[PDB]
Design a protein around this nucleic acid. Structure first.
Lengths: 349, 349
RNA sequence: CGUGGUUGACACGCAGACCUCUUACAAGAGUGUCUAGGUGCCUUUGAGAGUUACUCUUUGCUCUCUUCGGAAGAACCCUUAGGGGUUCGUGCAUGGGCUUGCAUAGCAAGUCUUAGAAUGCGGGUACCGUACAGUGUUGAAAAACACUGUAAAUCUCUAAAAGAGACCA
């Protein structure tokens, strides 16, 4: 159990009630983890590789993982202008992406569940939960959750966006989930679920495992934005595109704070390869291999590792990571058509 | 058409866009009318007999009438504490009451539709309408509709009670409704549906027919309350209960304004029996039979008709109206059991 | 846009733009790459009929002499040399004066400037120079010329279409 605990706890940066997590792992052989994904356009790296890492860690720990393809949820936040057909193509594209990048789907522990299909099949189960969750929460509490949409409390919220936290909270119980492994931006809704548990006096509250939000490639971008293709590495970005984006990426020398390249290495490269190799000429200290983030940050702060050397190794590593996805979308005709259609779609806020 | 227009218009006190109503009657042979009824406990007189009068008027005018048994709508407002089983029992009790009092169900123009069964059967049609209606409407607008629940905008509104106006507005289109024949307290949500039509650019807006709210038997009670059994005549109230309630009813002499008994005569006795007879001794001017409300108010204000005579004749007329319901619930075992169970239930606000 | 090479090849000066790199931009660099269009000509053209949702408005596309009497220019038929014959190229908007009420102007309305070509845009034209692929040809290269097609790749790619009201909800 302690090994399982360490593995899962490594997935998220924040864990609410770690003791409950440990008890769950000891007592339940196959805990249920989920994450919810709006098919909101081209997938950037945090959705593909970081989520693959988290999910594979969870499955290796013995957990079952439900990937929630949030198609009506995409509509409610007006993605692709609310066209369910374009949403469905986007979701199929996303599923193909996770398959190609190395999601352990074949292990039989990962299930892709579509929100519309599942809720339609069992609406009698679902909507009562939505309605009650609303009933036990006052309005301001729901508005506070709007960040799950990438929207602020000051935004003119369409009342469908007041819906949105309600069904997302309901999903936790409809899916019978034990671990809420989601981004920090989902935290407010996840907490809501525990609050609801108090109102209904349900002892077994869901765990919250909040993941780090990978910053955007430009300065001061706490999170990647699909609206700026230049700040974000997309799963199907060509090697030249990746190289250019990384080259332009913010990376002041000897400054670790807010250096998005370093977080890319920390959260993407090291968790994937377990090591990071910087290839340099003999005059430049030669090749150096880093097995921990601490070594990288130490040499970077000292100035032994200069951004000019850091970024090329970085780009090479991401290109290696992304090559299987490019190959899949090049070889598989259905994935190729899905990607063509997705790239043809205008991204809506 | 003009005869049909007069008949229908006589049903509601307010009619929005009367001209649209006239065109509707001229163009569509069978206009579809609805009203929604929360199975919220014992049926007080205005829910049974006045609605029978209105519905029979509409059907006599050739309209189709859908009686909406709003059981999820009942749950959302915590009626009977939100238990669908007591809600269903109450709804069956209401249907039995409407059958017994003389609802023209045999005519084939009145359809009792359950919110649960209908919405569950066609959720794909229903819930998108709810979601879009919410999407177009800002939150303050939804809260303003809370009166449809018997709740104020200052009440701690459960977010289910923000659901409630949206679901009710959606009902209008889900039922494909042409005439919203409902109480004045529904007006705000009814108007919402017309506003929605502008937003979706739907030319054919639903006609809005708002009924008078029958006052409670006590002074200053603009509407009957199920929380005060003494102020409300229940359809199954025994003759003695009716007599006592009418005796205690507010009825100052020569004062017409705010006099409930006169309102019952105007809205229940005349529309039912087309006349009302006050039986008096020869020394008290003998029996007098009134064919119109103007005669009633004139003689009452003059003081020729004293409350001591008005109340007995009034109670006699209500007892005559209610006797079929008492007989039904006495003879039919299923109705008898339903009434027993309903009377056993605590009314929740 | 200038300097020299009289001339041209060919060099210097000016400016910009594209491509890579020194990164985080900024900043900087690099001949790494790109930078002549004009000329003159025609062009307000009546009215009707046919051309899809049903009808109406606005068009677009087709059939008759086809506003100043539009085949402008092109090309083909012949033709003594002046010509004719044949096919095609056949667009949109405003004015200001006078005149009816408005202190005057807008605002509501009538003829006139075939259209004040008067003012604009658009398009079709033949010549020049651009490059390119072909062809001949002078040239060891560079450089030079006759012709061929273009310079906006290209086509309502309409399945006529935009609105209003009907079938009627």
């Amino acid at each position: 159990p302690e090994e399982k605990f360490k593995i899962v706890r490594s997935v998220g940066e924040e864990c609410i009630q770690e003791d409950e997590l440990l008890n769950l792992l000891t007592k339940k052989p196959e805990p249920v983890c989920y994450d919810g994904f709006e098919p909101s356009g081209r997938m950037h790296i945090a959705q593909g590789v970081m989520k693959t890492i988290s999910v594979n860690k969870l499955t290796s720990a013995g957990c079952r993982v439900k990937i929630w393809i949030a198609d009506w949820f995409a509509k409610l936040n007006n993605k692709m202008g609310g066209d369910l057909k374009k949403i469905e193509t986007v979701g199929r594209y996303l599923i193909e992406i996770w398959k190609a990048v190395g999601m352990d789907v074949e292990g039989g522990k990962v299930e892709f569940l579509w929100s519309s299909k599942e809720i339609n099949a069992r609406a009698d189960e679902y909507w009562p939960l939505v309605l009650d969750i609303a009933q036990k929460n006052n309005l301001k509490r729901i508005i506070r959750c709007s960040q799950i949409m990438g929207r602020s409390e000051q935004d003119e919220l369409t009342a469908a966006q007041i819906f949105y936290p309600c069904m997302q909270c309901a999903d936790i119980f409809f899916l019978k989930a034990d671990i809420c492994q989601l981004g920090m931006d989902q935290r407010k809704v996840n907490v809501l679920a525990r609050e609801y548990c108090d109102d209904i006096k349900r002892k077994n509250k869901p765990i919250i495992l909040s993941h780090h939000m990978l910053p955007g490639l430009q300065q001061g971008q706490e999170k990647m934005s699909k609206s700026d293709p230049s700040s974000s590495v997309f799963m199907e970005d060509e090697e030249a595109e990746v190289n250019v984006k990384i080259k332009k990426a913010y990376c002041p020398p000897k400054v670790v704070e807010g250096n998005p390249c370093l977080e890319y290495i920390k959260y993407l490269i090291l968790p994937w390869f377990n090591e990071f190799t910087v290839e340099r000429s003999a005059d430049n200290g030669g090749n150096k291999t880093f097995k921990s983030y601490e070594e990288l940050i130490a040499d970077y702060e000292s100035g032994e590792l200069h951004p000019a050397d850091l970024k090329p190794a970085l780009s090479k590593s991401l290109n290696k990571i992304l090559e299987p996805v490019r190959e899949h979308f090049r070889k598989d005709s259905n994935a190729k058509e899905l990607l063509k259609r997705v790239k043809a779609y205008r991204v809506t806020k």
